[PDB]
């Protein structure tokens, strides 16, 4: 790795984020807020995605 | 020595709950 090297030979930093989708409880979530709970009425529910 | 593994070794293949069903 020299600064004069061609871009193909120049150093690149790489980060790979790997996550498995919904099959169990979760600990990494987005910024989404929450709301109270209502029963016995047809509603649009979104439990942990 | 050897022995017979009668019916043991079955483990929950998925982390999803199910009920009253025969799943393959």
From Swiss-Prot, chain A:
Stretches for region Disordered: 23-45
Outcome when changing residue 23 to P: Increased resistance to human covalescent sera neutralization
Effect of residue 9 to H: In strain: Omicron/BA.1, Omicron/BA.2, Omicron/BA.2.12.1, Omicron/BA.2.75, Omicron/BA.4, Omicron/BA.5, Omicron/BQ.1.1, Omicron/XBB.1.5, Omicron/EG.5.1
Functional note: Attaches the virion to the cell membrane by interacting with host receptor, initiating the infection. The major receptor is host ACE2. When S2/S2' has been cleaved, binding to the receptor triggers direct fusion at the cell membrane. When S2/S2' has not been cleaved, binding to the receptor results in internalization of the virus by endocytosis using host TFRC and GRM2 and leading to fusion of the virion membrane with the host endosomal membrane. Alternatively, may use NRP1/NRP2 and integrin as entry receptors.
UniProt subunit comment: Binds to host ACE2. RBD also interacts with the N-linked glycan on 'Asn-90' of ACE2. Cleavage of S generates a polybasic C-terminal sequence on S1 that binds to host Neuropilin-1 (NRP1) and Neuropilin-2 (NRP2) receptors. Interacts with host integrin alpha-5/beta-1 (ITGA5:ITGB1) and with ACE2 in complex with integrin alpha-5/beta-1 (ITGA5:ITGB1). May interact via cytoplasmic c-terminus with M protein. May interact (via N-terminus) with host bilirubin and biliverdin, thereby preventing antibody binding to the SARS-CoV-2 spike NTD via an allosteric mechanism.
Full protein name: Spike protein S1
Organism: Severe acute respiratory syndrome coronavirus 2 (2019-nCoV)
């Amino acid at each position: 790795f020299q600064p004069t090297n061609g871009v193909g030979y120049q150093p690149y930093r790489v980060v790979v984020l790997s996550f498995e989708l919904l099959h169990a409880p979760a600990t990494v979530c987005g910024p989404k807020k929450s709301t109270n709970l209502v029963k016995n009425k047809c509603v649009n529910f979104n439990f942990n995605g | 020595a050897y022995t017979n593994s009668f019916t043991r070794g079955v483990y929950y293949p998925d982390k999803v709950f199910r009920s009253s069903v025969l799943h393959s």
